[PDB]
C-alpha cells in the first residue's frame, strides 16, 4: 500500500497501488466509485464526479486513459485532445480523492491478448463501420473495474449506447457493481457537453445547436406518433447549415431485438466539418 | 438477509446471487474462499482438486457443477462425494440463472485457443473462458483451482486472469492417475479392452520423454513418437513440446510436452513437464 493522504488529490499511475489503496479503503467502510474517463474533462465529467461524490462514505477514484484499443488506425488516437494539467487541476478544484492514470504498458503488457466480445450491438449504431471500437471499451472498462474494485461506475448518457453495453457487461459477467448512468450536461444553447466540440469553428458551433434542437423538438412533437417525432427532428436538421446526418434512429430504451413500444431513445450522429457530434434523447410515445 | 448457511455440512446453491451473498457473507467472517469449478460427473481427479482446496487454512470451499452448453449427469452421486469430503457449498446453476439474456457478452481468448485442442474445436476455449469468468465474479474466490490435465485450459485460465486484471489466484494441480499411468477421464470407461490397453502409451511416452530428455529436445519427442508408435489404434492428432506458457519451446529449460489421441471415438488427452538437458 502507498501514501494516501485523505482530503488531497492522490495520483496513482501503477494499477497495483490503486488497487492496493481502493481495497485498503473499502475494508475500513468507505465506499469506492469509479468514473472512468479519457481525459480532457469537461463540466459533462465534473457532473459524473459530482454525483459519486454524494454517494454518503464515498471515496471518489477518477481514471483518465487514452485507451487505444478503442480507436482504429487512421490518426484518431494521435488526435485525442489531452489536458492533463486542466484535468488534474478540475478533480483538484472537485475534491477527489483519487486520480488514475495507468500507462499503456501498464494496461497492454501482452498487447491484445484475452478481450471482451460485445453482444450484436456494438456492430450497429457507432460501431456499424467501427466494427471493433466496443470491444476495446468493454475491454478497458472490465480491467478498470477488476483493478478499482468499485461499489458504483459512473458513467454519461451522451454516449447512451457505450452506456447500454457497459450495463450489458455487467449483467452478462456478473459483475458486482452498480452502474450509474448520469444526464448528458449541456451548453446554454442546448449542445450536448463533449471533448469534441473544441473542433467547431464558430460557425459550426453555432450550426451544432441543430442537434439538440431536433432531438427536444422529437421529443415534445412524440404526443403525435414515433413519425411525428421522426419528421420533427429531421426538419430542424434539414434546415441546419453543414450539419451532415450520419444517422437518425428511434429505438426501444436497451436498444436492443425488441421494438419500440411506450419509452425510447432517439439517437442522432451528425458530422460538422470532420467533427462527428452525438446526441440522444428520451422519447414517451402518446 | 443472507441465505442460510448451516457450517459443516454441504449447503446447495442453485441461484447465482445465493451464492454470491453466502461467499461474501462467509469472507467477511475470516474465512477464504476457494472455488472447484467442475461439470459434474465426480471421479478422483475431481476429488484431488476438492482436497487441494480444503487444505488451505480458514478455506471454505465452493465447487460448482455445471454443464456450460458455451463449450454424464449423476447429480445426487456428485452430491454425495462431496458431502464425503466435507465440502460446504455446492453451486448448482441452470443453463437460463447463467445466462438469463442467452449468449451475448462473451470472452474472446488469445491465439493460443485457436491452437492444439483449438483445432477441432475452435470456440471451446471461448466458452471455457466466459463460464470461468463468471463463476469467479459470481464467486469472488481467494483462489481457483484447475487440474493439470487440461493444460492448455489451465494456461488459457492463466491468460484471463492477467489480461483481466482479476484478484484470484490460480492454482494447477497435478494430474491423477490409474495405477498403469492412463490419466483419469470421464472418456476411460468408453475404452473397449484393446483399446484401454493401448491407451497406457501416452502416459508411457510422455514419462519416456521426460527421462529422454537429459539427451535434449529431439532425443524426448522421438521417443514418445516410438512408444506412440508402439500402439494399435492410436490415432495421434499432435504431438507437441512447448514453452510452460505454450509459446515456442526455447532452446534450454523448461517446458511442457502434450500429446492428444483418437481411440475409435474416444479422444484422449496428456501432458508432462519437460526440463531440456
Redesign the interface.
Given at each position: 500500500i502507498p501514501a494516501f493522504h485523505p482530503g488531497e488529490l492522490n495520483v496513482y499511475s501503477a494499477?497495483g497501488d490503486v488497487?492496493d489503496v481502493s481495497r485498503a479503503l473499502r475494508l475500513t467502510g468507505r465506499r469506492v466509485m469509479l468514473v472512468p474517463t479519457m481525459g480532457a474533462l469537461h463540466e459533462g465529467h465534473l457532473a459524473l464526479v459530482r454525483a459519486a461524490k454524494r454517494v454518503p462514505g464515498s471515496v471518489v477514484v477518477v481514471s483518465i486513459f487514452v485507451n487505444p484499443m478503442q480507436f482504429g488506425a487512421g490518426g484518431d488516437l494521435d488526435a485525442y485532445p489531452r489536458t492533463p494539467d486542466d484535468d488534474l487541476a478540475q478533480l483538484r478544484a472537485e475534491g477527489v480523492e483519487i486520480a488514475f492514470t495507468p500507462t499503456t504498458a501498464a494496461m497492454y503488457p501482452?498487447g491484445?491478448?484475452?478481450?471482451?466480445?460485445?453482444?450484436?450491438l456494438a456492430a450497429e449504431l457507432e460501431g456499424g463501420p467501427r466494427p471493433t471500437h466496443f470491444?476495446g471499451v468493454?475491454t478497458v472498462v472490465?480491467?478498470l473495474l477488476?483493478?478499482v474494485?468499485p461499489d458504483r461506475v459512473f458513467f454519461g448518457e451522451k454516449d447512451y449506447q457505450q452506456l447500454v453495453l457497459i450495463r450489458?457487461?455487467v449483467?452478462?459477467?456478473?459483475?458486482?457493481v452498480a452502474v450509474v448512468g448520469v444526464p448528458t450536461v449541456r451548453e446554454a444553447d442546448g449542445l450536448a457537453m463533449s471533448s469534441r466540440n473544441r473542433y467547431l469553428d464558430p460557425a459550426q458551433r453555432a450550426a451544432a445547436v441543430a442537434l439538440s434542437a431536433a432531438l427536444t423538438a422529437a421529443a415534445h412533437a412524440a404526443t403525435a406518433g414515433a413519425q411525428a417525432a421522426l419528421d420533427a427532428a429531421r426538419a430542424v436538421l434539414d434546415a441546419a447549415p453543414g450539419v451532415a446526418v450520419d444517422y437518425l434512429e428511434l429505438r426501444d430504451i436497451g436498444l436492443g431485438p425488441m421494438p419500440l413500444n411506450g419509452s425510447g431513445r432517439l439517437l442522432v450522429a451528425a458530422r460538422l466539418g470532420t467533427t462527428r457530434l452525438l446526441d440522444n434523447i428520451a422519447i414517451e410515445i402518446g
Amino acid at each position: 500500500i502507498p501514501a494516501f493522504h485523505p482530503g488531497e488529490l492522490n495520483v496513482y499511475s501503477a494499477p497495483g497501488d490503486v488497487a492496493d489503496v481502493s481495497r485498503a479503503l473499502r475494508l475500513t467502510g468507505r465506499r469506492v466509485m469509479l468514473v472512468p474517463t479519457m481525459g480532457a474533462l469537461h463540466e459533462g465529467h465534473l457532473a459524473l464526479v459530482r454525483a459519486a461524490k454524494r454517494v454518503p462514505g464515498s471515496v471518489v477514484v477518477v481514471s483518465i486513459f487514452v485507451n487505444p484499443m478503442q480507436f482504429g488506425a487512421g490518426g484518431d488516437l494521435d488526435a485525442y485532445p489531452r489536458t492533463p494539467d486542466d484535468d488534474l487541476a478540475q478533480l483538484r478544484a472537485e475534491g477527489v480523492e483519487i486520480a488514475f492514470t495507468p500507462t499503456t504498458a501498464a494496461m497492454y503488457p501482452d498487447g491484445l491478448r484475452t478481450t471482451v466480445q460485445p453482444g450484436p450491438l456494438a456492430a450497429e449504431l457507432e460501431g456499424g463501420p467501427r466494427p471493433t471500437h466496443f470491444a476495446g471499451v468493454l475491454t478497458v472498462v472490465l480491467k478498470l473495474l477488476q483493478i478499482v474494485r468499485p461499489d458504483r461506475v459512473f458513467f454519461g448518457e451522451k454516449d447512451y449506447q457505450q452506456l447500454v453495453l457497459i450495463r450489458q457487461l455487467v449483467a452478462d459477467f456478473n459483475l458486482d457493481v452498480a452502474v450509474v448512468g448520469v444526464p448528458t450536461v449541456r451548453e446554454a444553447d442546448g449542445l450536448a457537453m463533449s471533448s469534441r466540440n473544441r473542433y467547431l469553428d464558430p460557425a459550426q458551433r453555432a450550426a451544432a445547436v441543430a442537434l439538440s434542437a431536433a432531438l427536444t423538438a422529437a421529443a415534445h412533437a412524440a404526443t403525435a406518433g414515433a413519425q411525428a417525432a421522426l419528421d420533427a427532428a429531421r426538419a430542424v436538421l434539414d434546415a441546419a447549415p453543414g450539419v451532415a446526418v450520419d444517422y437518425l434512429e428511434l429505438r426501444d430504451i436497451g436498444l436492443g431485438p425488441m421494438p419500440l413500444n411506450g419509452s425510447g431513445r432517439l439517437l442522432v450522429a451528425a458530422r460538422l466539418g470532420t467533427t462527428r457530434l452525438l446526441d440522444n434523447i428520451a422519447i414517451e410515445i402518446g
